[PDB]
Amino acid sequence: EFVPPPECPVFEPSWEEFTDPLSFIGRIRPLAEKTGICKIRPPKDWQPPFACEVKSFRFTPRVQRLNELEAMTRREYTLQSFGEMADNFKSDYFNMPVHMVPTELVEKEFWRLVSSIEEDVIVEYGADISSKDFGSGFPVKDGRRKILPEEEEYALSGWNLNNMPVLEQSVLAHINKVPWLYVGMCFSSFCWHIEDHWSYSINYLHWGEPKTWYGVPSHAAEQLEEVMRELAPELFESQPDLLHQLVTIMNPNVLMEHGVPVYRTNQCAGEFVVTFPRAYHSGFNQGYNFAEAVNFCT
């Protein structure tokens, strides 16, 4: 029953346009800020190596009940063992190999399960893993890991999320932030929110199955917030934004029915997603994947 929102802009910059990220994002701004989110595909030869300490990478993911709002209010893993769990869950759920499940089917099933009161689906998300714990997905000239000569251009690239500017201009900065990692599985999700201080954010999918995004342009931010408070459970209606944002899951078609412009995209491995200032966004993972994200300043 789910109607996919229209696709957000996708940019395939040339090698010349790929020289500086902030310069490129500034040039695409007239279009991309009207959609809230956009996708950027690097040149096909731009392939950074995965530089996390895989042997020691261990985490305890958080548990997500898809229908918790409809129902209630209304293990330690390695990267390998989490991937085995994630692939087994998806192949068992859809009764087919994980790479044969259409992205439109996972999308339709996700939003059906969020509002379903008869079926309780529970997944796990390896979220808010600091790049300091096991290293960034990008190579970094930190001295803690070896960098091959062919990898040094990626350690120095402006599209390396560790090299994005993160310092905001202020007077307090004169009288006086690292990327985070996300290990996803099928149906693991993030609800509608904006970044702190209305900041930009950039997201890179290092590997795995796609991450599905939904975005709302900043000019409709107040409209989305009014629809939320109208339709979010009245028990949470008076909560501050910073807390309400923890339980603001909502079908994009419901927002679209109330006149809120929503755009979608499937972020595939090796592709960037940029969220613009005060652009509400949400999404879910199609399967086992690994993403890295950071807020940056212009």
Task: Tell me: does residue 66 bind ligand H6J (CB under 6 A).
Answer: no
The one segment of 22-30, 82-90, 191-199, 230-238 that binds ligand H6J by CB under 6 A? 191-199
Count of residues near ligand H6J by CB under 6 A: 15
- Minimum gap (Å) between residue 287 Cβ and ligand H6J: 13
User: From residue 272, how far is each of 86, 112, 149 by CA, in Å?
Assistant: 23, 28, 24
- Minimum gap (Å) between residue 274 Cβ and ligand H6J: 13
> What is the CA angle 192-230-116, rounded to 5?
65
Task: Tell me: does residue 213 bind ligand H6J (CB under 6 A).
Answer: no
Residue 90, marked binder:
no
Task: Tell me: does residue 128 bind ligand H6J (CB under 6 A).
Answer: yes
Residue 263, marked binder:
no
What is the rounded CA–CA span in Å between residue 161 and residue 165?
Answer: 9
- Minimum gap (Å) between residue 221 Cβ and ligand H6J: 15
Residue number, 14 or 203, with CB nearest to ligand H6J: 203
Question: Residue for token digits 């603001």?
Answer: 248
Residue number, 147 or 268, with CB nearest to ligand H6J: 268
Determine the longest span between alpha carbons in the chain, in angstroms: 60
Residue 281, marked binder:
yes
Residues that bind ligand H6J (CB under 6 A): 125, 127-128, 182, 190-191, 193, 195-196, 203, 211, 245-246, 291, 293
